[PDB]
Motif scaffolding. Structure first.
Motif, PDB file in Angstrom:
ATOM      1  N   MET A  28      -2.932   7.341   2.022  1.00  0.00           N
ATOM      2  CA  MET A  28      -2.772   6.529   3.188  1.00  0.00           C
ATOM      3  C   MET A  28      -2.135   7.218   4.371  1.00  0.00           C
ATOM      4  SD  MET A  28      -4.650   3.971   2.884  1.00  0.00           S
ATOM      5  CE  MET A  28      -4.246   3.438   4.545  1.00  0.00           C
ATOM      6  N   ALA A  29      -1.170   8.063   4.091  1.00  0.00           N
ATOM      7  CA  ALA A  29      -0.532   8.817   5.139  1.00  0.00           C
ATOM      8  C   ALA A  29      -1.535   9.735   5.794  1.00  0.00           C
ATOM      9  CB  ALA A  29       0.678   9.587   4.572  1.00  0.00           C
ATOM     10  N   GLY A  30      -2.429  10.298   4.987  1.00  0.00           N
ATOM     11  CA  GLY A  30      -3.423  11.179   5.516  1.00  0.00           C
ATOM     12  C   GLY A  30      -4.436  10.456   6.400  1.00  0.00           C
ATOM     13  N   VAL A  31      -4.902   9.328   5.905  1.00  0.00           N
ATOM     14  CA  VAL A  31      -5.878   8.522   6.601  1.00  0.00           C
ATOM     15  C   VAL A  31      -5.294   8.081   7.935  1.00  0.00           C
ATOM     16  CG1 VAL A  31      -7.021   6.240   6.548  1.00  0.00           C
ATOM     17  CG2 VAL A  31      -6.999   7.844   4.530  1.00  0.00           C
ATOM     18  N   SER A  32      -4.024   7.588   7.862  1.00  0.00           N
ATOM     19  CA  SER A  32      -3.400   7.199   9.141  1.00  0.00           C
ATOM     20  C   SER A  32      -3.258   8.339  10.143  1.00  0.00           C
ATOM     21  CB  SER A  32      -2.033   6.597   8.818  1.00  0.00           C
ATOM     22  OG  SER A  32      -1.377   6.126   9.987  1.00  0.00           O
ATOM     23  N   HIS A  33      -2.841   9.508   9.640  1.00  0.00           N
ATOM     24  CA  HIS A  33      -2.692  10.627  10.471  1.00  0.00           C
ATOM     25  C   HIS A  33      -3.997  11.016  11.124  1.00  0.00           C
ATOM     26  CE1 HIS A  33      -3.047  14.991  11.162  1.00  0.00           C
ATOM     27  NE2 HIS A  33      -1.790  14.898  11.531  1.00  0.00           N
ATOM     28  N   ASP A  34      -5.067  11.062  10.373  1.00  0.00           N
ATOM     29  CA  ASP A  34      -6.324  11.520  10.893  1.00  0.00           C
ATOM     30  C   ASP A  34      -6.951  10.506  11.793  1.00  0.00           C
ATOM     31  OD1 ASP A  34      -5.810  13.866   9.496  1.00  0.00           O
ATOM     32  OD2 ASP A  34      -7.544  13.641   8.177  1.00  0.00           O
ATOM     33  N   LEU A  35      -6.851   9.240  11.510  1.00  0.00           N
ATOM     34  CA  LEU A  35      -7.429   8.232  12.362  1.00  0.00           C
ATOM     35  C   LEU A  35      -6.676   8.111  13.698  1.00  0.00           C
ATOM     36  CD1 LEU A  35      -8.336   5.401   9.861  1.00  0.00           C
ATOM     37  CD2 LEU A  35      -9.947   6.954  11.097  1.00  0.00           C
ATOM     38  N   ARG A  36      -5.421   8.542  13.733  1.00  0.00           N
ATOM     39  CA  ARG A  36      -4.667   8.463  14.926  1.00  0.00           C
ATOM     40  C   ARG A  36      -5.344   9.136  16.095  1.00  0.00           C
ATOM     41  NH1 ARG A  36       1.459  10.683  15.822  1.00  0.00           N
ATOM     42  NH2 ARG A  36       1.754   9.774  17.907  1.00  0.00           N
ATOM     43  N   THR A  37      -5.975  10.270  15.835  1.00  0.00           N
ATOM     44  CA  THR A  37      -6.571  11.015  16.956  1.00  0.00           C
ATOM     45  C   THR A  37      -7.692  10.227  17.671  1.00  0.00           C
ATOM     46  OG1 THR A  37      -5.788  13.116  16.067  1.00  0.00           O
ATOM     47  CG2 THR A  37      -7.738  13.179  17.592  1.00  0.00           C
ATOM     48  N   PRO A  38      -8.740   9.780  16.985  1.00  0.00           N
ATOM     49  CA  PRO A  38      -9.759   8.979  17.668  1.00  0.00           C
ATOM     50  C   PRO A  38      -9.253   7.670  18.193  1.00  0.00           C
ATOM     51  CG  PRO A  38     -10.256   9.053  15.294  1.00  0.00           C
ATOM     52  CD  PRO A  38      -9.172  10.103  15.585  1.00  0.00           C
ATOM     53  N   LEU A  39      -8.383   6.987  17.464  1.00  0.00           N
ATOM     54  CA  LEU A  39      -7.838   5.701  17.919  1.00  0.00           C
ATOM     55  C   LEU A  39      -7.075   5.875  19.198  1.00  0.00           C
ATOM     56  CD1 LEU A  39      -6.762   4.065  14.524  1.00  0.00           C
ATOM     57  CD2 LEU A  39      -8.810   3.480  15.933  1.00  0.00           C
ATOM     58  N   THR A  40      -6.303   6.971  19.308  1.00  0.00           N
ATOM     59  CA  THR A  40      -5.582   7.261  20.560  1.00  0.00           C
ATOM     60  C   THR A  40      -6.536   7.581  21.667  1.00  0.00           C
ATOM     61  OG1 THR A  40      -3.654   8.106  19.361  1.00  0.00           O
ATOM     62  CG2 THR A  40      -3.975   8.885  21.648  1.00  0.00           C
ATOM     63  N   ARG A  41      -7.653   8.257  21.371  1.00  0.00           N
ATOM     64  CA  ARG A  41      -8.600   8.532  22.427  1.00  0.00           C
ATOM     65  C   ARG A  41      -9.288   7.264  22.894  1.00  0.00           C
ATOM     66  NH1 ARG A  41      -6.089  12.355  20.859  1.00  0.00           N
ATOM     67  NH2 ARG A  41      -6.420  14.483  21.621  1.00  0.00           N
ATOM     68  N   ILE A  42      -9.524   6.287  22.029  1.00  0.00           N
ATOM     69  CA  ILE A  42     -10.089   5.030  22.464  1.00  0.00           C
ATOM     70  C   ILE A  42      -9.111   4.356  23.420  1.00  0.00           C
ATOM     71  CG2 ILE A  42     -10.904   2.752  21.846  1.00  0.00           C
ATOM     72  CD1 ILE A  42     -12.010   4.036  19.194  1.00  0.00           C
ATOM     73  N   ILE A  47      -7.685  -1.921  18.916  1.00  0.00           N
ATOM     74  CA  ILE A  47      -6.914  -0.769  18.465  1.00  0.00           C
ATOM     75  C   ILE A  47      -5.583  -1.162  17.822  1.00  0.00           C
ATOM     76  CG2 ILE A  47      -5.628   1.228  19.345  1.00  0.00           C
ATOM     77  CD1 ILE A  47      -8.822   1.659  18.922  1.00  0.00           C
ATOM     78  N   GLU A  48      -4.864  -2.089  18.475  1.00  0.00           N
ATOM     79  CA  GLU A  48      -3.605  -2.565  17.919  1.00  0.00           C
ATOM     80  C   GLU A  48      -3.903  -3.148  16.556  1.00  0.00           C
ATOM     81  OE1 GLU A  48      -2.353  -5.197  21.083  1.00  0.00           O
ATOM     82  OE2 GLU A  48      -1.176  -3.518  21.964  1.00  0.00           O
ATOM     83  N   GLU A  49      -5.004  -3.875  16.348  1.00  0.00           N
ATOM     84  CA  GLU A  49      -5.362  -4.399  15.070  1.00  0.00           C
ATOM     85  C   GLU A  49      -5.705  -3.338  14.076  1.00  0.00           C
ATOM     86  OE1 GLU A  49      -4.671  -7.199  13.900  1.00  0.00           O
ATOM     87  OE2 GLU A  49      -5.936  -7.385  12.117  1.00  0.00           O
ATOM     88  N   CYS A  50      -6.400  -2.299  14.497  1.00  0.00           N
ATOM     89  CA  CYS A  50      -6.620  -1.180  13.601  1.00  0.00           C
ATOM     90  C   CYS A  50      -5.313  -0.555  13.168  1.00  0.00           C
ATOM     91  CB  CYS A  50      -7.483  -0.065  14.199  1.00  0.00           C
ATOM     92  SG  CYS A  50      -9.156  -0.409  14.549  1.00  0.00           S
ATOM     93  N   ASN A  51      -4.385  -0.373  14.094  1.00  0.00           N
ATOM     94  CA  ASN A  51      -3.073   0.166  13.745  1.00  0.00           C
ATOM     95  C   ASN A  51      -2.341  -0.732  12.783  1.00  0.00           C
ATOM     96  OD1 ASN A  51      -3.622   2.420  15.295  1.00  0.00           O
ATOM     97  ND2 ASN A  51      -2.595   1.554  17.132  1.00  0.00           N
TER      98      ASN A  51
END
Lengths: 110, 111
Positions: free
Chosen positions: A59-73, A95-99
């Motif tokens: 989960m930590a990995g998934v969150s870390h990696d998804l952060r980049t595209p989510l931040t770009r959105i 995005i807030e919901e994805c977070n």
């Protein structure tokens, strides 16, 4: 015979399968077939421990990696025109919901 | 010895499982002797590996489930954006594709 070492290896294999992933596999330095078996059991233990550590860190990995595209959105919404302001707000809430979804996920498993 | 054959066979099975063939058949489990004791233990290891793999897959499928709704809503929103904001619609769609790719990559052990 070679009975005792086989039983010790089986006992260790059992302990590992049940969760003691750091147990030391005996007999890896024997010169005969028992050593060959022991090395193979050591390879199983290493595979288990890899997959265990991976499951724990997932989960930590998934969150870390998804952060980049989510931040770009989010940054793209920051750049949207006034005309499209309503869509910027809608997407940002998505995005807030994805977070929230990512952060909350582990709570379900605990 | 008379047990060398099955011991080496079991080692070869363990090696195949450790390499990722989690569905390998573990021979000689029916035996009551040392060989059968060993084979059953190796079966337990296989089952534990397969359970961890399955757990991982399940978790990632859950991530995908939960993210699908908001990411769909973002894709829909981009279809509504003005022409002048095309560049941003395009960028966001690329980012959604990257979310999907990251998830896929985790499932496939690429991450």
């Amino acid at each position: 015979t070679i009975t005792r070492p086989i039983i010790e290896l089986s006992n260790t294999f059992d302990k590992i399968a049940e969760g003691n992933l750091e147990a030391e596999v005996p007999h890896q330095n024997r010169a005969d077939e028992i050593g060959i078996l022991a090395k193979s059991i050591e390879r199983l233990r290493r595979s288990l421990k890899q997959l265990a550590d991976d499951r724990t860190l997932l989960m930590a990995g998934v969150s870390h990696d998804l952060r980049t595209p989510l931040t770009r959105i989010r940054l793209a919404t920051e750049m949207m025109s006034e005309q499209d302001g309503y869509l910027a707000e809608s997407i940002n809430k998505d995005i807030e919901e994805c977070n929230a979804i990512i952060e909350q996920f582990i709570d379900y498993l605990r």
